[PDB]
Symmetry: D2
Subunit: 123 residues, 4 copies
Amino acid sequence: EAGITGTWYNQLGSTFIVTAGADGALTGTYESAAGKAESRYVLTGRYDSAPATDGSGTALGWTVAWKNNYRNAHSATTWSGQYVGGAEARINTQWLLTAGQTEANGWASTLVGHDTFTKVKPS
Amino acid sequence: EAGITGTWYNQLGSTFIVTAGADGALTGTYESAAGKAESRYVLTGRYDSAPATDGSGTALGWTVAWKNNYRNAHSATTWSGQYVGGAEARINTQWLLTAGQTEANGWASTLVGHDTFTKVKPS
Amino acid sequence: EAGITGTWYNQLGSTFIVTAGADGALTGTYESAAGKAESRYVLTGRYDSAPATDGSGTALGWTVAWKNNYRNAHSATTWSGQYVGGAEARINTQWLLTAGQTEANGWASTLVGHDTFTKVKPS
Amino acid sequence: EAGITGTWYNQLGSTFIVTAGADGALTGTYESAAGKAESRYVLTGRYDSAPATDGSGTALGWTVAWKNNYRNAHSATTWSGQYVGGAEARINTQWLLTAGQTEANGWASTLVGHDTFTKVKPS
Ligand SMILES: O=C(CCCC[C@@H]1SC[C@@H]2NC(=O)N[C@@H]21)NC1CCN(c2ccncc2)CC1
Ligand SMILES: O=C(CCCC[C@@H]1SC[C@@H]2NC(=O)N[C@@H]21)NC1CCN(c2ccncc2)CC1
Ligand SMILES: O=C(CCCC[C@@H]1SC[C@@H]2NC(=O)N[C@@H]21)NC1CCN(c2ccncc2)CC1
Ligand SMILES: O=C(CCCC[C@@H]1SC[C@@H]2NC(=O)N[C@@H]21)NC1CCN(c2ccncc2)CC1
């Protein structure tokens, strides 16, 4: 009933596969079409399992650490956003991507951006 | 060996209790001293379980959805940052806090900020 | 030659009117179609007046304080982004919107988002 | 009366020299102690010249493009924040630093961070 479980695609062509559990959990895999990434990475997150009923979206977030058996990019992305249902359902997000840095370079550790996920792929 | 498992406190006085699993998982609870929050909330996230050895920090992230048995603030925060070890260990983060909004208000859904966690409480 | 001077429209329908001076200055007016805003506000900013020639965009930023003769929303937005030329020229930005807050509420002062500007209006 | 005009120092040791004009303008120079920066750069911005009187801070923002006669880092930073007066006056900010990138790399153009400015230097 949450509308979230399934496969989602962003504007870069990345693939977000997620299960929204009854307890508020998000689990799944992420495959990025961009950056220092190859194949699937574990993700986990949380969502509001009792959202408002006034047309507001459903708040959520998740994390990927960019380490798997094929690569380690010494970094992690978190996406914070909301699911907005309907015939053209979307998950609208903004993200923070932190790379490990020495203390001297810590000020320059974190990229910010935004991803829009839909249930069908962009062309 | 990761240095992450345990209790951490930020500059607001919030309490972050986390277990860093051997597989890269973060699990635990978060108690915020600020905002529309009461008692403990579930968190989950990920960290780089094989960080660089050049003095760089360990990248990580986690999510809290602000729903428990006592409150629902129809929102979720993700923290993205890194752990920096030593005698004054820290987790330096930046966060995104998305609230569910109607489509018309979506542009105004997301707060950004920064939290510094240490192993002893601020005064 | 910079391609920046003129009128630009974002996805909300806001109107950004700017002059890019030879010295790196941006001046102009901003009219927001969203939020606590009415009519035109002063803006000022800066851009890279000698960008790279490898196809990279031109970095820039500007600020609006949301006070004019008709409203005061006790807030300011900064947009940071780049101009990307061509037949479908764009200014791709991300923004930070800070509202004045008491010290206790300072953690919740700042919204983040993203605006895409084009030379013709969205429909 | 605004409290803003003068010299300010952040936690990196950078020096922000600003004049707050009666019309809401900020002008001055910025010297960064970090990154691809040498000597002083022009800045310009805006502030709320009629802030609330309830103890809330004064909203403001400014931009530096990282080009002067000595360097060009093909980038620009905007700081968005507020001035909080008193015996230990501060300007609390968050910033976005966009670097020119090709279209393919645009997703990775923008760093985010936070700077705290005070009227005396850190040690
Ligand atoms: O490229 C990756 C890992 C893959 C990220 C993919 C990103 S996630 C948000 C966006 N949405 C997607 O679907 N895909 C992209 N990691 C880097 C990034 C840049 N890095 C630094 C280093 C130093 N300072 C700052 C940044 C080094 C490590
Ligand atoms: O207050 C909370 C839940 C608790 C958040 C606590 C935050 S997490 C980052 C920081 N670090 C901490 O340790 N504690 C704080 N949620 C709101 C926030 C403001 N909300 C909106 C609504 C509409 N538009 C924008 C924002 C409504 C819901
Ligand atoms: O609405 C405005 C002024 C107009 C902003 C228009 C925005 S600029 C980025 C975006 N692009 C546009 O073209 N238009 C929009 N200001 C508020 C916002 C919310 N405010 C708070 C208060 C307390 N905490 C957090 C936030 C109160 C003051
Ligand atoms: O280093 C500078 C210019 C000086 C910035 C100084 C910064 S301003 C916020 C902070 N507060 C200060 O007082 N000082 C620092 N510019 C870069 C940054 C990293 N760059 C990229 C490239 C590609 N992708 C992402 C990022 C390349 C250009």
